[PDB]
Design a protein around this ligand. Structure first.
Ligand SMILES: Nc1ccn([C@@H]2O[C@H](COP(=O)(O)OP(=O)(O)OP(=O)(O)O)[C@@H](O)[C@@H]2F)c(=O)n1
Ligand SMILES: Nc1ccn([C@@H]2O[C@H](COP(=O)(O)OP(=O)(O)OP(=O)(O)O)[C@@H](O)[C@@H]2F)c(=O)n1
Ligand SMILES: Nc1ccn([C@@H]2O[C@H](COP(=O)(O)OP(=O)(O)OP(=O)(O)O)[C@@H](O)[C@@H]2F)c(=O)n1
Ligand code: NA
Ligand code: NA
Ligand code: NA
Lengths: 534, 534, 534
């Protein structure tokens, strides 16, 4: 059958939760047995988020194929089982970069290269490339309708709708319906003006998703329908929910998936949301409560640790525990000491780059190791764990990473090419995406993962220095996992500790609310067990 | 069968010939056996054009039922055989007048009366009133898309399309496609911008009629289709033709009627445009040529005499005479004398109000009478013919109308209530629309109309003074027609003349290019006869 | 000195509190010694709100000259000491009514009457009429920028700005800046889009007043300035304050009046807001608390009783009583009985029309009288108080108003022309605006107003029947006030009661927060006295 496209646009404001809304709709369609994918079109000129600061954009999501993408693809993978790739995320920058390259080498045969049709054609090609061979493709258009940055995307999808036909294309538009205290009424005017803006660029929306702090009553939905040339049943209320896992249910209860399947002439069974009903239940009914400190350098923006914060919450779902995440500035541990780590049932040190706040994270890994507080180190969290141990147990004074102190005596962490020992002797690449890791037979990790070989995702350059490893191993530290021919250290553990695991890979990118994650399941359990020994 | 609506809008500029294009489309649909009507929605505040001077938006057209309307209804009646009434023309003024009246007396029951829905409801009610009981209703929206004055009409028809459904409603949009000499190319940008403007108001055009001084090539039509979400075959070219009677053929040859009948699911035969082909043939194959002088006070805007000019052309068709119409200012006859009436094969004095330029018309009527030049007087053209004959034959010094000189000794023209004689002795209201007129047995008009009674349309309050008539009759003037129990003089003749006729009514409003008009056929024949004699 | 105009527009949503913001700005300019006025341009088709039910856009405000106006004029009179008249409020309906009347009788001399210039000219003439002879005129444009209904007003004021010049005209634009919980950020996008919409109509705002549930931070204000061609200091924040009396101070503290006086070249002293500081102080420092029950038929929209609710708050200010207003449906008293009138320190029955809920108010007046609960009746609240006393004390079975029961034996309230007695014997028009009322020597109101004559504002046609009055007077009811040569009953009192007063007029329309109102000051004092006694 012909591939169907749902173009999802945002009006009035950004921060409507358009990613989660699109992911939720994809979840309902997947729950119908449909082959569904989602792609994010980002209006930024960055060729990809690889260069971007976590504090500004939020976390860099890493796909299996090793693409650095918008954190929204994390939302997508946590709602549908289709694996994201490079084909599921592209930016204005990628499109202009491609068109400029083709132009400079002469692929347009001396033609004038214009936003229309050359930029729009490049956009359409990447949308077809990522979509074709699926039943339904959700295409999330970043930016707000009315802004300059999204116009080429909006013109591209307008052209696609006409070419492919309106039997296989829907326009879905999210708007804000603000509630005013003074009048006690919700306002449809912003939605009306947003739809006019969308029409002015040549797009008639087929479905309106109205975001408000409460449900949009029938009267206001009827007003929106009348003013926006949209049938009443295609005006969906999506209130501020206490849990995003409810959103698939709320959309189904309003017939959104029925309307879509009718429009695309899909005969498929009723959506089975039983896994989501289970997730909703687990989250609403925690038996215990835990305070887990996340000690890092990007806590200025929580979205910097989006997938880590979500992976913890998923650990809470599997153990029926309410995880209170305390975001602690690692630089505050340097200034004010381990005083601010007191009253934590567990400690997590997530990913990061740069020396700023790293000495605070080293101190944190020590305090966790010495006081038997459950610890999970991710990438940089493993680096500071190996440094702490080598520095304070194996007695390798000032042991550090070459990333932070290039010419230190004991570079316990360094690039493969920088690998040297304490005397400066030597022997004789960025790691991105899914890599097979070999677990050790007696390790806490091999128990939790319940398998010999795991696949987790890397985004790191600096590796555990194999030339200084044996000296750290003999001082008590255990290597729980390794990968490849170079036998690179993937996971370390501290025996004589209730729960101490640090890994190079980013386990948070494979964690889902439905299937959870072994490491975070274990980690939150250990946090619970620790909390009821006080 | 549900009534189908075609909403005709104009963009870029006014003066696109939107009325003639709508009329021409109606003529194709009429030629398919469809029950078709047209209505004009005028954005002006005047309750009707009754108060408006003809130097503004042109002549005041009068319908059978006595409605004063836009001259566009003249175009409608000349292209389809459906008779126009008050239901076929209304203004913003009419809508506001009706809604304000209803509001003031309390019909809206304490509701806030708003443009939406109260003004838009009133507009839709009048469109449904004028339209329902027809197969296809063409609704011409006056003004230009993007202007404030038309927005209530556009919002009204947007709501109609949604309510009635898109199976029974089409949006047809006329645009300008200018030719630029500099690039020798035709420009689609105005059409693109006009369609965006129409979309921003919530209307997707289904058909684009592109007006240019030449045919719009296939590539530019394909470009318009691409940018305007309109199928390529729904992009119609309409060049500036030498004859408006060719337009129905040009629209048919591009499949406009085929597209409309498909969208509306109408099983009707192919259009037989034989009647229009015949008119085109007649017009292109004249045998002789005449110059007819039209002497009036509104010549500065020819559309002041739209129906009269067209009626003269129809007379030409019926005699195979090419009519050269010379518009002559009656005020120039007051200054420069009868010198400017030389080289005329016939003289027409059309309708008008106010004394300005009337003495020039009286002189013109005298000149036509004394030099045996064929003369047709319409309304004022009859008044000045009666005045001429009263002064210069019946020897009534300064004989005039009370409209111009209230207290003259010989008010040969006056209101029925003002009727007096030369000594001021008396006997013991506006006429609008179709009135029966009794024709006199041995009269020129009796043999032209070939019937004892005729129906013609009036717009005048100033009648022939019956108290001074008997004196003018004895002096040689023949009453050729009377009407009503008041035996009001409708037609006069000077029988010592080849062709001298003047009527109170506006015969030009019943003249069509297909069926012609007896009076004008005779006038142009007399002009041809006069031309031959020189 | 040339009169200066500040055009106040709203974008994004209605219910921005635009009237109170304009009034507050007027109050700052008043406190600088400037001769300031405000006018409201309402986009509704109603010629005036006289026909409108109070459940629509709220209470019908009445001016001294007897004009029925938008309740915004209530806000204006409560913030400046300039008296509002018919010149301070007009609707689209009024403009169209005037232009249609002029057009129909022929004032436009055969011209085509268009929205531009004829409607826009009529609007500008009324703005100049209401404004000229003042230093600064605030012109509040009703509706929201982007809507059809306001476009004639916006085009009118655009033309005014150009004609008068930008040395004497400012555009002030109110927008919503929503807070999003998801991102914990404030959103400028709606303001950006609203300013673009205003610019697309040809208006560059000079000042932006940003409405949010909190202060708009400096960075977001700088962003708004950047995108909207507006200086940073002309971007004013206005949070949702706990008291509207603080708004003048907040606008002054951001230099709004300084910017306005600079742009208009006005040498006037710094604003002394001592009167507003005093009101704020009074409001924030109550000594006691009372619950006053307001029993009416319009409680579903509180703004139906805007001026009454405000008048009760002003009474509270003058007694340092915090007034808890309980809105009670009079229909609930008809069903559930006087049970719901328990725990009330005083009862107010405000104005209204129609029989619906009146029997509940009669019961309420009885309950207040018999249980010695302080009672204020306004217009209908007086009618039901007279009816109560006629039935239950003067023993007149089913005594009523002719408005509700036309043919009752005892029409104690009726039109002057309907006045009859119990046996149907007779004696041998709308009251609007300020009328003098004579107060009786030994009356409660005579001592509250401390004057023999008072000026109060009327809106009623149904008077006290003087033919049945003498019977009710003998039964104990005291006439406290009369007016005119017809000695119509204006105020009644039950003198066997701590505080029972009811007036025909609307005292709430002359009550201000600064100068209070004698009647309401007394009512709230009586409520305080009653509260203490329990
Ligand atoms: N294109 C449009 C749309 C609307 N209007 C007008 O709008 C006014 C209602 O004024 P409102 O502030 O209450 O706006 P509303 O439509 O109710 O939406 P909201 O309140 O839920 O935000 C009403 O006279 C009219 F419909 C308009 O003029 N042109
Ligand atoms: N919404 C739009 C539409 C078009 N464009 C651009 O427009 C440029 C061609 O500029 P042109 O003056 O030649 O305009 P064109 O479209 O050929 O119509 P025409 O009047 O010439 O017949 C071309 O780089 C690109 F298509 C645009 O930016 N945004
Ligand atoms: N005419 C405009 C204005 C802006 N843009 C773009 O807008 C994007 C930021 O998108 P945002 O949702 O964050 O909007 P922002 O401007 O911050 O206001 P706010 O509501 O968040 O307070 C940013 O890449 C770029 F500025 C645009 O394309 N064309
Ligand atoms: Na509203
Ligand atoms: Na071109
Ligand atoms: Na932002």
């Amino acid at each position: 059958m012909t591939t169907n496209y749902i173009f999802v646009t945002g009006g009035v404001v950004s921060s409507l939760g358009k990613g989660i809304a699109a992911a939720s709709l994809a979840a309902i369609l997947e729950a119908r047995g449909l082959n569904v994918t989602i792609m994010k079109l980002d209006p930024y000129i960055n060729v990809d988020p690889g260069t971007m600061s976590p504090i500004q954009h939020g976390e860099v999501f890493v796909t299996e194929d090793g693409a650095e993408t918008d954190l929204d693809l994390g939302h997508y993978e946590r709602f549908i089982r289709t694996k994201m790739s490079r084909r599921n995320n592209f930016t204005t920058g990628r499109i202009y970069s491609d068109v400029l390259r083709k132009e400079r080498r002469g692929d347009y045969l001396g033609a004038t290269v214009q936003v229309i049709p050359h930029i729009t054609n490049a956009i359409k090609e990447r949308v077809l490339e990522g979509g074709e061979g699926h039943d339904v493709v959700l295409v999330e258009i970043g930016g707000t309708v009315g802004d300059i940055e999204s116009l080429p995307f909006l013109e591209a999808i307008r052209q696609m709708a006409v070419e492919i036909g309106r039997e296989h294309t829907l326009f879905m538009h999210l708007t804000l319906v603000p509630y005013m205290a003074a009048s006690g009424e919700v306002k449809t005017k912003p939605t009306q003006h947003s739809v006019k803006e969308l029409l002015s660029i040549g797009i008639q929306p087929d479905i309106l998703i109205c975001r408000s702090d409460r449900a949009v009553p029938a009267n206001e939905r009827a007003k929106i329908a009348l003013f926006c040339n949209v049938p009443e049943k295609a005006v969906i209320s999506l209130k501020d929910v206490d849990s995003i896992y409810k959103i698939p249910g709320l959309l189904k209860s309003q017939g959104l998936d029925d309307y879509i399947c009718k429009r695309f002439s899909l005969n498929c069974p009723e959506a089975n949301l039983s896994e989501w009903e289970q997730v909703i239940f687990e989250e609403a009914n925690p038996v215990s409560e835990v305070t887990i400190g996340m000690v890092g350098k990007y806590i200025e923006l929580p979205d910097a640790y989006k997938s880590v914060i979500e992976a913890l919450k998923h650990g809470g779902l599997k153990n029926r525990v309410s995880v209170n995440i305390k975001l602690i500035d690692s630089q505050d541990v340097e200034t004010r000491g381990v005083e601010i780590l007191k009253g934590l049932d567990a400690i997590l040190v997530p990913g990061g780059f740069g020396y700023r706040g790293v000495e605070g994270m080293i101190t944190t890994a020590r305090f966790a190791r010495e006081n038997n507080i459950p610890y999970l180190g991710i990438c940089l969290g493993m680096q500071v764990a190996l440094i702490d141990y080598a520095r304070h147990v194996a007695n390798m004074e000032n042991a550090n990473s070459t990333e932070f102190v290039p010419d230190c005596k004991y570079p316990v962490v360094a690039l493969i090419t920088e690998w040297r020992d304490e005397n400066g002797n030597v022997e004789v690449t960025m790691r991105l995406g899914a890599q097979q890791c070999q677990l050790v037979d007696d390790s806490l990790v091999r128990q939790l993962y319940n398998a010999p070989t795991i696949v987790e995702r890397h985004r790191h350059r600096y590796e555990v220095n194999n030339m200084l490893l044996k000296q750290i191993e003999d001082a008590g530290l255990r290597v729980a996992g390794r990968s490849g021919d170079d036998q690179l250290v993937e996971i370390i553990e501290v025996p004589n500790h209730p729960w101490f695991v640090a890994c190079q890979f980013h386990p948070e990118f494979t964690s889902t609310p439905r299937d959870g994650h072994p490491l975070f399941a274990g980690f939150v359990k250990a946090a619970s067990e620790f909390q009821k020994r006080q």
